[PDB]
Amino acid sequence: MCDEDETTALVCDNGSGLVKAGFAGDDAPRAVFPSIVGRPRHQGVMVGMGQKDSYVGDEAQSKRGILTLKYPIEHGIITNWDDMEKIWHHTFYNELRVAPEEHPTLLTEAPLNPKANREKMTQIMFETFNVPAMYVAIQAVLSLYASGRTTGIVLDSGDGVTHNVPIYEGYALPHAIMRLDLAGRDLTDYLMKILTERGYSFVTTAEREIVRDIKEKLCYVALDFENEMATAASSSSLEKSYELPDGQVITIGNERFRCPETLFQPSFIGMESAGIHETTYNSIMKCDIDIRKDLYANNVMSGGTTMYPGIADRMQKEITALAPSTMKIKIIAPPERKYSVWIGGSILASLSTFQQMWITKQEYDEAGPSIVHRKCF
Amino acid sequence: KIAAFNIRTFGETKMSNATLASYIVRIVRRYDIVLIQEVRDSHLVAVGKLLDYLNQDDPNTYHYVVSEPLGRNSYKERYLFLFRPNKVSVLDTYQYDDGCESCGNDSFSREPAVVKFSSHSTKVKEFAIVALHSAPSDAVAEINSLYDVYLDVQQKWHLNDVMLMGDFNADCSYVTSSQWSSIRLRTSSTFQWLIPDSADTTATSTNCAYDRIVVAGSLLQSSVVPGSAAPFDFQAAYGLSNEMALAISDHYPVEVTLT
Amino acid sequence: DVKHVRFAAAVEVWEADDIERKGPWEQAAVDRFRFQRRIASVEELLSAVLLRQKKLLEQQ
Amino acid sequence: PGLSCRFYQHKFPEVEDVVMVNVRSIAEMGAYVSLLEYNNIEGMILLSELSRRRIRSINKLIRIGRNECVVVIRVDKEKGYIDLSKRRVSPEEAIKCEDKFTKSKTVYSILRHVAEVLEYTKDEQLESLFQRTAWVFDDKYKRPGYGAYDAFKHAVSDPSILDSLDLNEDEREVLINNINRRLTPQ
Amino acid sequence: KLNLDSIIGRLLEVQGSRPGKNVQLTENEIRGLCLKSREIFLSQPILLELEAPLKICGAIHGQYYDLLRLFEYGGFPPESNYLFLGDYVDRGKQSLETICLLLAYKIKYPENFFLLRGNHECASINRIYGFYDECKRRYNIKLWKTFTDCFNCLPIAAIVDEKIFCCHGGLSPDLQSMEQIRRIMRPTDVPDQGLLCDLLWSDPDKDVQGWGENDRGVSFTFGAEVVAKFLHKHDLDLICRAHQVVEDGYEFFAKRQLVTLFSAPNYCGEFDNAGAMMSVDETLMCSFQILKPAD
Numbered sequence A: 001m002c003d004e005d006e007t008t009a010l011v012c013d014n015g016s017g018l019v020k021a022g023f024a025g026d027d028a029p030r031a032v033f034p035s036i037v038g039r040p041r042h043q044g045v046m047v048g049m050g051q052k053d054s055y056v057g058d059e060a061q062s063k064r065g066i067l068t069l070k071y072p073i074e075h076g077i078i079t080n081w082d083d084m085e086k087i088w089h090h091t092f093y094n095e096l097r098v099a100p101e102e103h104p105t106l107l108t109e110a111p112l113n114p115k116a117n118r119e120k121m122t123q124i125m126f127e128t129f130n131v132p133a134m135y136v137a138i139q140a141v142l143s144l145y146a147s148g149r150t151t152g153i154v155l156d157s158g159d160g161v162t163h164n165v166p167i168y169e170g171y172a173l174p175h176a177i178m179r180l181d182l183a184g185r186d187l188t189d190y191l192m193k194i195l196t197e198r199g200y201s202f203v204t205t206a207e208r209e210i211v212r213d214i215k216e217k218l219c220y221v222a223l224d225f226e227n228e229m230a231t232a233a234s235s236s237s238l239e240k241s242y243e244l245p246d247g248q249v250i251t252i253g254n255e256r257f258r259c260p261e262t263l264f265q266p267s268f269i270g271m272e273s274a275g276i277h278e279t280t281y282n283s284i285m286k287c288d289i290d291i292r293k294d295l296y297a298n299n300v301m302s303g304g305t306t307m308y309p310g311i312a313d314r315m316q317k318e319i320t321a322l323a324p325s326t327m328k329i330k331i332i333a334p335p336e337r338k339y340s341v342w343i344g345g346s347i348l349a350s351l352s353t354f355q356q357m358w359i360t361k362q363e364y365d366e367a368g369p370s371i372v373h374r375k376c377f
Numbered sequence B: 001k002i003a004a005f006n007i008r009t010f011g012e013t014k015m016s017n018a019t020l021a022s023y024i025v026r027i028v029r030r031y032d033i034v035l036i037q038e039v040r041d042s043h044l045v046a047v048g049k050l051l052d053y054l055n056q057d058d059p060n061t062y063h064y065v066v067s068e069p070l071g072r073n074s075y076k077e078r079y080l081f082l083f084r085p086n087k088v089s090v091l092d093t094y095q096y097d098d099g100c101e102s103c104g105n106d107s108f109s110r111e112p113a114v115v116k117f118s119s120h121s122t123k124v125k126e127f128a129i130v131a132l133h134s135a136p137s138d139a140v141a142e143i144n145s146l147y148d149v150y151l152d153v154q155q156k157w158h159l160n161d162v163m164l165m166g167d168f169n170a171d172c173s174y175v176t177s178s179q180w181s182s183i184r185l186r187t188s189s190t191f192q193w194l195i196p197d198s199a200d201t202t203a204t205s206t207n208c209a210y211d212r213i214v215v216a217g218s219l220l221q222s223s224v225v226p227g228s229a230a231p232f233d234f235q236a237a238y239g240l241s242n243e244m245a246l247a248i249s250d251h252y253p254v255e256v257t258l259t
Numbered sequence C: 001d002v003k004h005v006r007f008a009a010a011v012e013v014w015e016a017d018d019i020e021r022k023g024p025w026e027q028a029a030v031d032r033f034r035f036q037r038r039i040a041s042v043e044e045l046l047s048a049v050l051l052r053q054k055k056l057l058e059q060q
Numbered sequence D: 001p002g003l004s005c006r007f008y009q010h011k012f013p014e015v016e017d018v019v020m021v022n023v024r025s026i027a028e029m030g031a032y033v034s035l036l037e038y039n040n041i042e043g044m045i046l047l048s049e050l051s052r053r054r055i056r057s058i059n060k061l062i063r064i065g066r067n068e069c070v071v072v073i074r075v076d077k078e079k080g081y082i083d084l085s086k087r088r089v090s091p092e093e094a095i096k097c098e099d100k101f102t103k104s105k106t107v108y109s110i111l112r113h114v115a116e117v118l119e120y121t122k123d124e125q126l127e128s129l130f131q132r133t134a135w136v137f138d139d140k141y142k143r144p145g146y147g148a149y150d151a152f153k154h155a156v157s158d159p160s161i162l163d164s165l166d167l168n169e170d171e172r173e174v175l176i177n178n179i180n181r182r183l184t185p186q
Numbered sequence E: 001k002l003n004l005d006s007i008i009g010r011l012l013e014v015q016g017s018r019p020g021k022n023v024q025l026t027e028n029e030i031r032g033l034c035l036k037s038r039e040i041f042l043s044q045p046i047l048l049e050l051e052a053p054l055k056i057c058g059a060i061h062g063q064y065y066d067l068l069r070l071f072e073y074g075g076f077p078p079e080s081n082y083l084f085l086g087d088y089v090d091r092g093k094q095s096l097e098t099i100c101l102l103l104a105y106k107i108k109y110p111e112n113f114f115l116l117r118g119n120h121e122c123a124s125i126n127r128i129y130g131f132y133d134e135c136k137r138r139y140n141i142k143l144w145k146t147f148t149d150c151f152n153c154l155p156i157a158a159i160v161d162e163k164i165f166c167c168h169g170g171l172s173p174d175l176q177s178m179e180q181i182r183r184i185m186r187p188t189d190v191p192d193q194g195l196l197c198d199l200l201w202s203d204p205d206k207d208v209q210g211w212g213e214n215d216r217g218v219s220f221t222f223g224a225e226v227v228a229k230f231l232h233k234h235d236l237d238l239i240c241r242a243h244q245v246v247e248d249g250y251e252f253f254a255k256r257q258l259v260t261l262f263s264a265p266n267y268c269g270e271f272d273n274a275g276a277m278m279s280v281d282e283t284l285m286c287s288f289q290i291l292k293p294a295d
């Protein structure tokens, strides 16, 4: 433990839906909040307070209506630094409540994060928060480390992007990576769309939050879409009912699996691109035939959109259909995978060898934000 | 020129039927300071909608003060103050404290929000506004408790020039003629009563003095233009039908005018 | 002044509260230990990787 | 290595259920155990009541390698934590547990050996064999373990109750044979 | 200055709470309490000599709400002198409110209020019964390492009116003379073995003669005769002691010449016990008051 206190480090997962934040060596992040910044459209004040320049997080979310909400990360990439800086500030001083000049900080970047963004993100930590030291590691490589592998292939599927990331001996393979610009946000919108077909409606800014809730309770991936459709058409066996906050009850049927089916059939939301299974396969086919065996054996899921029931079974089937029938296919779907990335940082942060790795503010001041390219994978 | 306005269940619904939003913004443009009550809004989307209408010509046509949600049970409401920043400026604001509700300490359902305004153009130069939407059942207790709120303003800002106004529900079924004897705010010589017990502040076929304005302090009491205190009957003014009127709200704004 | 001990035989009684008493901390310690074992499990494997990254990147 | 499986359809025990556990190791904050009934999942028995500076093997007769009766206090399915206590188990509950365990272990002992004769090479096939065989009865009696054991004993009186199970002839032949070897009362 | 009354104010203010409300203080307030009380403990004797009347209390184990109701009936300091028989931290919801309130009163009234060292008042154990985690979350480990250096200086045992011997745990095979106590230096950890350890860790047992072994895996049990032997040798009349839950809150042993006190009622929610305290009258006539839970 901290038998003499070497300072507990911080771990920050910069999600495009949700930022995740806590202390190294804890087994869960303390603080998880929406990655939104909201500047006021109008001049005024909350009773008993002064005029604020910008809310963040749930404070922004609950004051939505008088703000211009902005997400500073789009599709896993940071687009808007002057807002990103406010999300880090809110993380440190409001959520973790720690002075960041005391604590080393480990940061997560999406796959293929362009060189300029990785620099800029280093520079803001050494010049705006004066942190003692910090480190940047690829979000999917941490989800693999959480599961206790160094070779594997992670489908990581969050709110704003989905990625297939073949990793070998701890490095993600750059070229083999597949993106897909479909994720849990689109699934929420598509679920609103299909739920309008039963005459339900979701205009009010409360109601779109309920639809995100329905998605992450009642949906699941069916193993055979057509047969499930037939089952749903013929029988009330699959229908579940959700109680809205006002006391009205709505029933969900084929929607339950139509929704995440879109990961296998992107064409349902009009995306002319291959489904998560084809993308998986393709990714593996881009890797050396030598290692494909390991990748097939160590397929891992990660991120909140992989939390559907049945999804590992459907991936087992679908990849078995595309693979040579000789291979041991294996899908791993850890129960915590909702936070596999964070936890992977937490673990990585806590290692005896790891606290030799990071860039110190000493090194930073001596070499500038270019050094982050020497001290990421 | 100051006014209070109970807009029955002001919220994202009502601000989207753009016929109603038009009428409501036509009403609200009347005022230099206006208090808007029954804000049933959880994300400030109704309020943002209103501000975008008001500020569409000039980005500072109006500024706003808005309370966090108030209530004992889950039926929260907010207070909204809208003021034109070129006439007045808000100096300070707070909510009057009544303790934790589980332990039974609370005195008000909706913790009166209180505001101190600079007014460079008027005779009275600094003065304070107390906002109350009473719970109809507790009318007697809550109006009486405002006296302690006034004392707290004297203690907090050292200011006698104070204006109390809102929907006190202070007529008919919720405060009958006899109950006034109990109420410090009415029986004390500290306070003038500007909205009389004869004033219809209802768009409904009631005849009920539900909204009220009450003023303390010498500068302020003399700043009132005499006889100017009244309801603003928007049904009469804009020539609406009964049904369109109630679609806006059942309680008219009430106003008073300052020199 | 040789005082010597005596007992009041009957005893006062006061009703103790219903307020629920179990601390979560007793459990959170277990979690901290489970997790610390989880780290130590991984470290053999994961440490090799980081050292390899270190040695490769120290060339630059 | 050979095939293994869950005794019951449920992948995890519920809280307030009493379960049979093998004490695997002793650590500072309690004893690490393996839940025999749930495919040797890790649980942990908490240091409880009397304060210990350090724990001798002998304490509460917890020992090592022993099978013991415990109640489930807390489950985090999200993290896979199961926390157990020996303190709250009554002696009659221990006996009921040992009975439930003995019966269920018997049913498992048959079906693994059935899968051995059927030459099933995957735990997936073994689970499928359980789903179609034991767990149908587990539902029929709405009882974990007892339902399977009761049906398997009925199969000695009359085998026709095995027909509704959706079996290959080979599975049914092997099962009838295997039951006869294990439950014909000596 | 340390704003001692502001600390005590906020601590007591939650008495009427339902649910069990937390109290919020700063690291430099609580860091103050430790560094200011540390001086007090190092000034006063390692073996306390005290004078009646005083109320004596057993383990509290962070059962803060119960501690408040003990004071509610027993009277807040200094209107009643107090001696507490250790085990302040761990297990209960609110270790920090508990130890802070007791450290506060120990600075406010340094000659009217006393704390003895329990077994839990050492690092190695509150590491594992949860106090370290109550710190690690609500403040930080750096704070906890200060509380340890406070606890490493508390007094071990008390003798009231030269006639009642109090300590947390019990006797020792090695406790032959009081001077062996007075020769222990502070600061100190609790070692695994020997006089200091045994004082904190040992137990009475009616099924034993002489120095039996202890299931706690450190130090001894002792039998009904060993009490009688010890009392005579030091001209005492009573041992009072804690360290062990007992249903009545007060449990006599050895022919009514030793008593064990547990002050925490309904301990951890795991047990159905009453909690109790012992009012020593000036004439050295003891009496008991019992905080008993509803069935």
Ligand SMILES: Nc1ncnc2c1ncn2[C@@H]1O[C@H](COP(=O)(O)OP(=O)(O)OP(=O)(O)O)[C@@H](O)[C@H]1O
Residues within 6 Å of the ligand: A014, A015, A016, A017, A018, A019, A075, A076, A157, A158, A159, A160, A161, A162, A183, A184, A185, A212, A215, A216, A217, A302, A303, A304, A305, A306, A307, A308, A338
């Ligand atoms: N149990 C669940 N079932 C379905 N969807 C879920 C579940 N839990 C979370 N999600 C969804 O997962 C998404 C959040 O996952 P995650 O936090 O990994 O996204 P992120 O990391 O912010 O996004 P990205 O990785 O794209 O930047 C949201 O769309 C959320 O609604």
Ligand SMILES: [Ca+2]
Residues within 6 Å of the ligand: A014, A015, A016, A139, A158, A303, A341
């Ligand atoms: Ca992510």
Ligand SMILES: [Mn+2]
Residues within 6 Å of the ligand: D051, E059, E087, E118, E119, E120, E242, E243, E244
């Ligand atoms: Mn003890």
